[PDB]
Amino acid sequence: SMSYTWTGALITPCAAEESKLPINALSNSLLRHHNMVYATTSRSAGLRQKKVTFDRLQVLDDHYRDVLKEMKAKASTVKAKLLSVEEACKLTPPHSAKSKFGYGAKDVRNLSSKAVNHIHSVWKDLLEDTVTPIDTTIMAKNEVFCVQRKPARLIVFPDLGVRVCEKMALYDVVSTLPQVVMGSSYGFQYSPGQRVEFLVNTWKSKKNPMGFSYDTRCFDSTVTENDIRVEESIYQCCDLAPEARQAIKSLTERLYIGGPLTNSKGQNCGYRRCRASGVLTTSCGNTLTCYLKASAACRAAKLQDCTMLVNGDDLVVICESAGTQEDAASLRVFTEAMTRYSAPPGDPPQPEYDLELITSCSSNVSVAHDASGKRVYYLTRDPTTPLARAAWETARHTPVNSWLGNIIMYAPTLWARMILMTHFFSILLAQEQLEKALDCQIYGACYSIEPLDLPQIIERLHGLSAFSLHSYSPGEINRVASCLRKLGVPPLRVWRHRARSVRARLLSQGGRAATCGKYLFNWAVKTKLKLTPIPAASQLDLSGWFVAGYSGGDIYH
Ligand SMILES: CC(C)CCn1nc(N2CCCC2)c(O)c(C2=Nc3ccc(NS(C)(=O)=O)cc3S(=O)(=O)N2)c1=O
Numbered sequence: 001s002m003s004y005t006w007t008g009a010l011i012t013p014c015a016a017e018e019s020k021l022p023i024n025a026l027s028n029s030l031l032r033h034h035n036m037v038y039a040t041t042s043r044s045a046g047l048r049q050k051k052v053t054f055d056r057l058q059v060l061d062d063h064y065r066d067v068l069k070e071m072k073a074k075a076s077t078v079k080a081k082l083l084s085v086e087e088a089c090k091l092t093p094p095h096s097a098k099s100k101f102g103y104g105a106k107d108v109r110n111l112s113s114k115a116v117n118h119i120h121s122v123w124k125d126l127l128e129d130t131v132t133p134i135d136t137t138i139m140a141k142n143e144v145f146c147v148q149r150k151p152a153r154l155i156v157f158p159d160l161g162v163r164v165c166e167k168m169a170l171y172d173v174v175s176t177l178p179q180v181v182m183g184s185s186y187g188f189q190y191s192p193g194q195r196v197e198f199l200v201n202t203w204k205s206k207k208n209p210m211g212f213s214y215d216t217r218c219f220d221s222t223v224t225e226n227d228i229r230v231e232e233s234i235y236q237c238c239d240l241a242p243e244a245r246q247a248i249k250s251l252t253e254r255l256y257i258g259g260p261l262t263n264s265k266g267q268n269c270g271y272r273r274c275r276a277s278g279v280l281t282t283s284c285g286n287t288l289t290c291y292l293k294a295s296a297a298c299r300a301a302k303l304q305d306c307t308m309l310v311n312g313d314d315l316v317v318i319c320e321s322a323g324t325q326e327d328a329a330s331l332r333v334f335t336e337a338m339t340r341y342s343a344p345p346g347d348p349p350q351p352e353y354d355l356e357l358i359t360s361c362s363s364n365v366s367v368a369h370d371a372s373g374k375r376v377y378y379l380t381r382d383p384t385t386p387l388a389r390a391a392w393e394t395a396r397h398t399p400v401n402s403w404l405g406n407i408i409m410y411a412p413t414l415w416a417r418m419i420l421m422t423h424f425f426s427i428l429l430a431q432e433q434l435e436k437a438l439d440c441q442i443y444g445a446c447y448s449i450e451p452l453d454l455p456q457i458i459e460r461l462h463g464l465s466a467f468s469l470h471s472y473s474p475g476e477i478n479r480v481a482s483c484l485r486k487l488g489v490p491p492l493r494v495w496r497h498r499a500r501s502v503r504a505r506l507l508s509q510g511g512r513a514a515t516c517g518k519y520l521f522n523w524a525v526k527t528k529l530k531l532t533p534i535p536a537a538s539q540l541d542l543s544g545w546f547v548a549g550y551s552g553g554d555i556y557h
Contacts, residue, residue: 001055001056001224001225001273002053002054002055002056002273003053003054003055003056003221003222003272003273003274004049004052004053004261004270004272004273004274005270005271005273005416006049006053006269006270007267007269007270007540009132009263009267009269009270009426010042010045010046010263010269011042011045011046011049011138011139011140011154011263011269012042012263012264012265012267013041013042013139013140013264014139014264017039017041017042017043017142018039018041018142018396019038019039019040019041019043019394020034020037020038021034021035021037021038021391021392022392022395022396023395024394024395026394026395026427027275027391027394028397028492029423029490030387030390030391030394030419030423030489031387031391031487031488031489031509032487032488032489033486033488034391035147036146036147036388036486036487037144037145037146037147037388037391037392037487038144038145038146038147038149038199039142039143039144039145039392040140040141040142040143040144040145040149040150040152040153041140041152041519042139042140042152043152044140044151044152045140045151045152045154045202046151047151048140048151048153048154048251049154050112051151051218052154052220052221053221054221056221056222056224056274056342057341057342058224058226058340058341059340059341060341061296061300061340062225063295063296063297063299063300063337064293064296064341065314066296066299067292067295067296067299068136068230068234069290071181071182071234071291071292072233072234072237072286074180074181074236075177075180075181075234075236075237075518076238077180078173078176078177078180078237078238078239079238079239079240080172080173080176080238080239080244081172081241081242082168082169082172082241082243083168083169083171083172084168084169085116085119085120085123085164085168086111086116087095087167087168088119088164088168088171089108089109089111089115089116089119089164090109090556091167091171091555091556091557092105092108092109092160092163092167092554092556093105093239093446093554093555093556094109094556095158095399095438095446095535096108096160096163096554096556097137097157098160099115099118099159099160099161100159101118101161102114102118102160103115103118103160104160105160108160108164110296118161118337119161119165119554121161121166122159122161122165123168123247123262124165125167126165126169126246126247126251126254127243127246127247127250129250129254130246130249130250130253130254131253131254132254133254133259133260134158134253134254134255134257134259135158135159135259135260135262136156136158136255136259136260136261136262136272136276136278137156137157137158137159137263137264138154138155138156138261138262138269139154139155139157139261139264140152140153140154140155141153141154141155144385144388144391144392144485145385145388146384146387146388146487152372153277154277155277155278155552156261156272156276156277156278156279156298157276157277157278157279157552157554158255158278158279162255162529163280163554164354165247165251165557166251166279166280166281166554167280167285167554167555168245168247169243169244169247169248169251170235170248170251170280170281171280172554173235173238173240173248173284173550174280174281174283174284174548174550175547176548177234177235177238177284178284178287178548179547179548181234181288181291182287182288182291182310184198185291185307185308185309186287187309187311187314187361187549188283188287188311188443188546188547188548188549189285189546189547189548190206190546191461191462191545191546192378192379192409192410192412192461192462193378193379193461193462193463194546195309195361195379196311196365196378196379197377199309199316199318199355199358199360199365200316200355200365200377202307202309203318203355205307205442206305206306206318206319206320206321207320208320208321209249209318209320209321209353209355210318210319210320210321210327210351210352210353211316211317211318211319211351211352211355211358212316212317212331212349212350212351212352212358213315213316213349213358213359213360214294214316214317214334214335214338214345214349215315215345215346215347215349216313216315216338216343216344216346217344217345217346218292218346219275219286219290219312219313219343220275220276220277220282220286220313221274221275222274222342222343222344223274223275223285223289223342224273224274224342225257225258225273227285227342227524228252228256228275228285229252229257229287230292231256231281231284231285231288231289232248232249232256232341232542235248235479236249237247241250251281254317255272255276255279256276256279256281256285258271258272258273258274259271259272259276259496260272265414272303276552277551277552278552278554279552279553280550280553280554280555281553282312282551282552282553283312283443283444283548283549283550283551283552284548284549284554286312287311287312287549290310290312290313290314290315290343291308291310291358292510293338293341293342294308294310294317294338295308295335296337296341296465297335297337297338297341298317298319298334300333300334300336300337301330301333301334301337301387302330302333302451303317303319303330303334304319304320304322305319305320306318306319307319309360311361311549312361312549312551314360314361315360315403316358316360316412317334321351321353321432324351327351328351331348331349331350332350334349335348335349356473356475359381362378362381362382362385363378363379363380363381364380364381365377365378365379366378366379366380366468366472366473366475366476367473368412368414368469368471368472368473368476369469369470369471370465370468370469370470371468372492376412376465378412378413378462378466378469379409379410379412380410380412380413380414380415380476381410381413382479382483382516383413383415383416383419383479383480383483384458384483384486384487386402386403386406386410386415386416386420387415387419387483387487387489388487389402389403389406390402390403390406390419390420390423390424391487394423394427396521399439399473400439400440400441400446401438401439401440402440403424404424404438404440404442404449404451405424405440405441405442406420407420407421407424407454408440408442408449408454408457408461409442409459409525411458411461411462411466412462412465412466412469414469414472414476414477414480414492415466415480415483417469417520417523418492418496418499418523419489419492419495421499421520421521422495422502422521423477424451424500425451425502425506425516425520426498426501426502427504428451429502429506434451434452434513434516435450435452436450436451437449437450438450438451440522442545442546443525443546443548443549443550443551444550444551444552444553444555445550445555445556445557446555446556446557447545447557449555451516452512452513452515453512453514453515453540454516454520455467455480455515455518455519455520455534455537456534456536456537456539456540457540457542458519458520459519459533459534459537460537460540460542461542464531464532464533466521467519467520467522467531468522468531469523470523482494496523496524499521499523499524500521500524500525502517502521503517503520503521503524503525504517505517506520506521515534518531519531519534543555544557
């Protein structure tokens with residue numbers, strides 16, 4: 001069937017949309033080539049609709065069914081609980097889209113009566129009706145990039161009432177099931193450091209390692225009714241309350257399999273027969289489906305000593321090489337199998353024999369050196385999108401602060417330390433907003449973070465090593481330098497100069513601010529300070545951070 005059917009009604013915005021980078025008094029200090037930076041808007045949604053609309057064929061063989069049986073046997077060991085209305089409510093982000101039925105996210109969060117009462121009626125309807133398709137809104141994402149222009153991604157999501165109900169039925173399931181079914185292959189269980197560790201140990205575990213990333217073309221669109229029903233049958237293996245079983249059956253039939261699409265004006269835009277990108281099960285559903293298909297394709301291609309790492313639609317495989325000719329042949333067969341299962345590639349995969357050249361989840365393993373001179377592996381990425389977004393964020397308040405997310409996830413990196421930390425601490429100092437909590441997104445879920453906790457956060461996730469790294473790789477240094485030339489970002493020596501100032505200003509404030517100065521900016525001084533563990537570091541509850549992925553899942557932790 002077709003992934004989408006369209007009526008011709010447009011995908012429409014809620015408010016005016018900016019596509020050009022906003023400029024303020026701070027912009028030039030970060031980036032001179034403003035025309036290189038853009039945001040996607042609904043006005044390009046038609047281009048996206050074109051790309052994501054196609055027929056899906058699916059041919060399922062014994063490998064597919066063998067792997068599904070295995071996954072189901074592991075899923076049968078999972079026991080999951082229903083969430084209360086109140087529990088689900090507290091998982092709703094403050095900025096989440098309002099209901100059509102007369103309440104908003106903040107009415108949900110402080111548990112207003114009107115909100116709770118509608119949520120109860122949505123649940124009851126789900127229990128009582130397992131056939132009536134549930135309304136969804138289709139919107140165009142506003143995301144920031146550097147010109148290479150990408151059309152807007154689409155988001156499809158049900159009403160706030162339903163979203164709360166999804167959490168009630170499925171939050172526990174999607175939080176716990178994937179690691180049990182997929183074990184070490186489940187990507188969202190890892191911090192950046194742990195992900196590095198897994199990749200490195202896996203690479204070393206092979207006599208002659210070969211790895212490839214596999215890019216499915218428009219993964220959500222390739223997901224069929226079959227796939228979504230199969231994913232439900234996996235959830236149904238769990239030990240669940242009777243109401244949970246019913247609600248999951250109902251959500252699958254009425255929501256997950258497909259449904260009508262409504263624009264922000266209330267017009268029927270058409271019909272969806274593929275993955276909704278804005279439902280609770282998007283991440284878990286995609287991960288299970290990617291893993292199921294990839295696992296079976298590995299068996300089809302007879303890949304030797306395969307190890308998969310799967311993060312929703314993002315897939316990387318490390319295996320034993322058979323030489324370049326046989327590896328190329330193997331991947332072609334792997335790709336043929338994936339194609340038959342309805343996951344054909346965007347870029348065809350290519351075997352890689354250098355771990356540092358494998359990009360997976362937009363990132364790669366690289367190497368630098370700690371204080372002792374000892375080599376330390378860490379996760380990095382091309383800093384172009386991070387810097388484009390940081391520039392947008394310099395002039396505009398956004399619901400999600402990608403700069404803060406990038407500092408957390410990419411703290412050991414040359415570009416996050418020298419540029420992101422320096423820039424945004426300067427901004428926070430000037431406004432005296434060091435103490436103000438900011439929202440960021442990690443593995444799809446929204447976190448309120450106090451910037452002053454950064455040193456504790458980085459110590460816990462990455463270790464004190466992250467404040468001491470030096471002698472980065474020629475490839476990494478060149479990629480950063482190239483990026484700065486592209487965007488017209490000041491050379492790394494200007495940032496060192498600015499960092500000395502930011503460090504000194506922070507030290508003058510004493511307290512947590514001084515702690516930021518000492519740890520975050522020790523790289524900036526010729527004669528360093530001795531960095532020892534931070535006392536308060538244990539107090540922070542980082543449980544829940546790297547357990548599961550929740551993209552489009554409307555989660556607040
Ligand atoms: C250590 C890490 C692997 C480095 C790269 N990195 N960095 C992230 N962050 C850096 C600062 C902002 C968040 C981040 O959250 C993700 C991330 N991975 C995903 C991959 C694939 C899908 N596909 S889907 C729609 O769920 O089917 C979704 C997600 S996500 O939305 O849960 N977020 C990430 O991969």
